[PDB]
C-alpha cells in the first residue's frame, strides 16, 4: 500500500504532496519521499483497483480528521476558560510522549535541563540544543553563564554534524537519565489562584498581603492586582461609580476598550453619560473598524487602573 | 455501482447534516441530559 | 541520586573526617535535626546519618514546586509526616550510595532501623566520652 | 460508546461541546478531550445505528436531568425556610464526599485545617491551598500568623508545579489523617435559635440576657436583637402602633421597604395614614421599578430599628 500511496502522491502534484507531508508524521514523510523517488510502479488495473478500494473503504477519515484538534481546543476554551483550556491542551499534548530522551528534555523545566546539561562538554550541549525545541534552548542559554552561553552559541553557529555512533550514544545516555525520572511536574496555583484567594479575605489582611508582596517584588504585586479585577466585573459596578469614573476616561480610549467588550457592558456603561454622548459613542463604535487587541488591551488596562485608583481613593463602589 | 454508492453517500451526508442539526436542538433543550447519557454510556462500556 | 530525585544539580564537598568524643558531636548538632539510626551489618553497633534542617528544607522546597527563591527559614520547627517521608526517600538513596561505596573495600549491608528528631533518643555510644568518627 | 460520544461531540461544535464539558465530571471531561483529539473513528452505518439507539434508548434523561438540583433547592426553600433549606442543601452536598484527602480538607472547619497544616512546610501549605477551595484557603490564611501568611502567599504567587510522586505522597499522608477522623461536625443552634429561645421567656430575664450579651460583645447583641424581630411580624403590630410609627418613617424609605413586602403587610400599613397618603403610596409603589435588595434590606432595617426604639420607649404595642 505504501508504494501505491507514493505513486498517488507523485501523480497528485508538488503542492498537494507537500501539504500532505506537512500533515504527515516524520517517519511516514521520510518513507514516502524515499519510496517515490526510489522505485515507482504503475499498474493499469491493480493500481486502479487499489485506489477504488481506498476511496470506498470508509467515509470516517474525511470528517473526524478534518477538524479534530481545533474542535477540542475550541471546546476546552468555551467549557471552563482560557486558563483551564491551556492546562487541558498541555495535558493532551503531554499524553503523546517522545521515545528518544533528547526530545523528552524539552518537556522538562528550563532550570532542570540547564542544571542537567551545564557540566556537559560544550559541543554536546550544542548538539542537544539543535535537537531541542528552539524556545526551550533559548531559555536554557538564558539560565547559562555568559561565558558558557557565548561558547555554546558560537558552537551552534559553526556546527558540523555528528557521527551517528556518538549521537546514538548520547541518545541512550540521555534516555537512561530521563526515562527513569518523573517528567510531568504538575503546576497548580500561580497568580490567578493567589488573586482569587486574596479577593475572598478581609480588607485589612488584603492590604497587608499586597503590601508584603510589593515589598518582596513590585511587579508581582502589580500582576496580582491586575488579576484581582479583570475586565469582566465592570458589569457589577454601580451606576454612580460608572458616572464618576466617566469623568476621567478618555472618549477614544473608552471606545477602543469597549469595541471588543460585551454588548451588556457597553449598554451598562452607556447609561451614565448623556443621550447625545451615548449616541456619539454608539456611532463611533459602529464606525470603528477592527483593530489589534494589543492596543485595546492597553486601553482597557488604563481604564481599569483609573477605576481602581478611584475606588482606592473612596469615590467608587460596586454592586 | 458507483452511482448507487454516490447516492447512498449523498443520503448519508444529507440525513447526517439533518442529524447534526437535530442533535443541536435537543442539546439546547437539555444540555445536562446529553452529558448524563454520555457518562452512562461510558459506565456501561466498562 | 540527588540529581535523579530533585531534578537539579547538587555539588557535595566532603569535609575533613573528625575523630571526636560522642558528646562533642552531639553538642555541635543543632536542634531539632533528623537522626537516622542505621545498622552496618555484620559490624556490631549502630551508626548515625544526620540530615540538617537546611537540607531537608531545600529538598522539600524543590520537590513541592519551589525554585528556592525565598531564603530557608528554620526556627526549631519539627518534621511532619510528609517531611519524614521525603527524608526517608532521600535516605534510601543515601544508604544505597553508602553501601555501594563500602562494597568496593568491604561488602556491607545498610539497614535503616529508626529515625528521631532529638539528640537524647539515639545514645549509640555506651558512654558520652566514647570516640566516634564523623 | 466513549469513542462514539467523542465523535458526536466533535461533530456537534465547540460551543455545545464546551457546555457539555461544563455539565460533565472531571474524569469524563478529560477522557472526552483526550479521545476526541487522539484517535477519531467515523462509521457510515455503525455510528448511525449507535446514534439512533442512543436517541431511542430512553426519554428519562431529558426531563429529570433538565431540572434536578434547582427543583430540590426550591422545594427545600419553600418547605421549611431559608435557614433550614441551607442545612438541607449542605447535607445533600455532603452526601457526595471526596476520595483524596486534600479535597476532604475543605469540608473541615477553617480553624481545624489551620491547626492541622500550620506546622507543615510552607511549600506544602501552598500546594494544599491551590488544591483546596479558594474560599476555604482565604479563611485559613486569615487564621494564619502574618509572617506565615505572607510567606505562603508569596509561594502561591510563584508556584512552579509539584512532582507527581510528592503529590501522591501528600495525598496518601493527608488521607490517612482525615479518612479516620469524623468530618461532619453538626452545627445545631446559632443565633436564630438563641433569639427564638430569648423571645419566649420573661421580660426581666430577656433584658438581663441581652445586656449580658452586649457586655460580652455588642455586635452579637445587635445581631440577636435583629433576629429577634424579623420583617415579617409587622402584620401582628397594632394599628395604633403603626400609626404612631408612621410619624417617624420616611416616605421614600417606607416605599422602598414595602416594595418587596407582602401585599397583606402593605394593606395593613396603608390603613394608618390618610386616604390621599395611601393612594400616593400605592401610586409610588406601582410606578417604582425593580431595585436591588441591598437597599431595600437597609430601609427595612432602619424601619424596624425605629419601630423597636418606639416600642422600647413605650409608645407602641403588638397584637
From Swiss-Prot, chains A, D:
It comes from Salmonella typhimurium (strain LT2 / SGSC1412 / ATCC 700720). GO terms for cellular component: bacterial-type flagellum basal body; plasma membrane. It holds the Pfam family FliG_N. It is found in: Cell inner membrane; Bacterial flagellum basal body. The record marks 155 as: Part of the EHPQR-motif. A motif (Part of the EHPQR-motif) lies at residues 120-123. One of its GO terms (molecular function) is cytoskeletal motor activity. FliG is one of three proteins (FliG, FliN, FliM) that forms the rotor-mounted switch complex (C ring), located at the base of the basal body. This complex interacts with the CheY and CheZ chemotaxis proteins, in addition to contacting components of the motor that determine the direction of flagellar rotation. It is a peripheral membrane protein. Keywords: Bacterial flagellum, Cell inner membrane, Cell membrane, Chemotaxis, Flagellar rotation, Membrane. This is Flagellar motor switch protein FliG. The gene is fliG. The lineage of its organism: Bacteria, Pseudomonadati, Pseudomonadota, Gammaproteobacteria, Enterobacterales.
Swiss-Prot record, chain B:
The basal body constitutes a major portion of the flagellar organelle and consists of four rings (L,P,S, and M) mounted on a central rod. The M ring is integral to the inner membrane of the cell and may be connected to the flagellar rod via the S ring. The S (supramembrane ring) lies just distal to the M ring. The L and P rings lie in the outer membrane and the periplasmic space, respectively. Disulfide bonds: none annotated. The chain holds residues 514 to 559 of 560 of the full protein. Belongs to the FliF family. It is found in: Cell inner membrane; Bacterial flagellum basal body. Induction: Inhibited in nutrient-poor medium. This is Flagellar M-ring protein. The M ring may be actively involved in energy transduction.
Curated annotation (Swiss-Prot), chain C:
It is found in: Cell inner membrane; Bacterial flagellum basal body. Changing residue 88 to E: Altered motor bias with clockwise rotation, partially suppresses a yhjH disruption. Belongs to the FliM family. FliM is one of three proteins (FliG, FliN, FliM) that forms the rotor-mounted switch complex (C ring), located at the base of the basal body. This complex interacts with the CheY and CheZ chemotaxis proteins, in addition to contacting components of the motor that determine the direction of flagellar rotation. This is Flagellar motor switch protein FliM.
Amino acid at each position: 500500500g505504501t508504494d501505491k500511496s507514493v505513486i498517488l502522491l507523485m501523480t497528485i502534484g508538488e503542492d498537494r504532496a507537500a501539504e500532505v507531508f506537512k500533515h504527515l508524521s516524520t517517519r511516514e514523510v521520510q518513507a514516502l519521499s524515499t519510496a517515490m523517488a526510489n522505485v515507482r510502479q504503475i499498474s493499469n488495473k491493480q493500481l486502479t483497483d487499489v485506489l477504488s478500494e481506498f476511496e470506498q473503504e470508509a467515509e470516517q477519515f474525511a470528517a473526524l480528521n478534518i477538524n479534530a484538534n481545533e474542535y477540542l481546543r475550541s471546546v476546552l476554551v468555551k467549557a471552563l476558560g482560557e486558563e483551564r483550556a491551556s492546562s487541558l491542551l498541555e495535558d493532551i499534548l503531554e499524553t503523546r510522549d517522545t521515545t528518544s530522551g533528547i526530545e523528552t528534555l524539552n518537556f522538562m523545566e528550563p532550570q532542570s535541563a540547564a542544571d542537567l546539561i551545564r557540566d556537559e562538554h560544550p559541543q554536546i550541549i550544542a548538539t542537544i540544543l539543535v535537537h531541542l525545541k528552539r524556545s526551550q534552548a533559548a531559555d536554557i542559554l538564558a539560565l547559562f553563564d555568559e561565558r558558557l552561553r557565548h561558547d555554546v552559541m558560537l558552537r551552534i553557529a559553526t556546527f558540523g554534524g555528528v557521527q551517528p555512533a556518538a549521537l546514538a550514544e548520547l541518545t541512550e545516555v540521555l534516555n537512561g537519565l530521563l526515562d527513569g525520572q518523573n517528567l510531568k511536574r504538575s503546576k497548580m496555583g500561580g497568580v490567578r489562584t493567589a488573586a482569587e484567594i486574596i479577593n475572598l479575605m478581609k480588607t485589612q489582611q488584603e492590604e497587608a498581603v499586597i503590601t508584603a508582596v510589593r515589598e518582596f517584588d513590585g511587579e508581582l504585586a502589580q500582576k496580582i492586582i491586575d488579576e484581582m479585577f479583570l475586565f469582566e466585573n465592570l458589569v457589577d459596578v454601580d451606576d454612580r461609580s460608572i458616572q464618576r469614573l466617566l469623568q476621567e476616561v478618555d472618549s477614544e480610549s473608552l471606545l477602543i476598550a469597549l469595541k471588543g467588550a460585551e454588548p451588556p457592558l457597553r449598554e451598562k456603561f452607556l447609561r451614565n453619560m448623556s443621550q447625545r454622548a451615548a449616541d456619539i459613542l454608539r456611532d463611533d463604535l459602529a464606525n470603528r473598524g477592527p483593530v489589534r487587541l494589543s492596543q485595546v488591551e492597553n486601553e482597557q488596562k488604563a481604564i481599569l487602573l483609573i477605576v481602581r485608583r478611584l475606588a482606592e481613593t473612596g469615590e467608587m463602589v460596586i454592586g | 455501482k458507483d452511482e448507487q454508492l454516490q447516492q447512498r453517500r449523498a443520503n448519508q451526508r444529507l440525513g447526517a447534516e439533518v442529524m447534526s442539526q437535530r442533535i443541536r436542538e435537543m442539546s439546547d433543550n437539555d444540555p445536562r441530559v446529553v452529558a448524563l447519557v454520555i457518562r452512562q454510556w461510558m459506565s456501561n462500556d466498562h | 541520586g540527588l540529581f535523579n530525585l530533585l531534578r537539579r544539580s547538587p555539588d557535595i564537598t566532603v569535609g575533613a573526617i573528625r575523630i571526636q568524643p560522642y558528646h562533642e558531636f552531639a553538642r555541635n548538632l543543632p536542634v531539632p535535626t533528623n537522626l537516622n539510626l542505621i545498622h552496618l551489618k555484620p559490624l556490631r553497633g549502630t551508626g548515625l546519618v544526620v540530615f540538617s534542617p537546611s537540607l531537608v528544607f531545600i529538598a522539600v522546597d524543590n520537590l513541592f514546586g519551589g525554585d528556592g527563591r525565598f531564603p530557608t527559614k528554620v526556627e526549631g520547627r519539627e518534621f511532619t509526616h510528609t517531611e519524614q517521608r521525603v527524608i526517608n526517600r532521600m535516605l534510601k538513596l543515601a544508604l544505597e550510595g553508602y553501601s555501594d561505596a563500602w562494597k568496593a573495600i568491604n561488602p556491607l549491608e545498610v539497614e535503616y532501623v529508626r529515625s528521631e528528631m532529638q539528640v537524647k533518643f539515639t545514645n549509640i555510644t555506651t558512654s558520652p566520652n566514647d570516640i566516634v568518627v564523623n
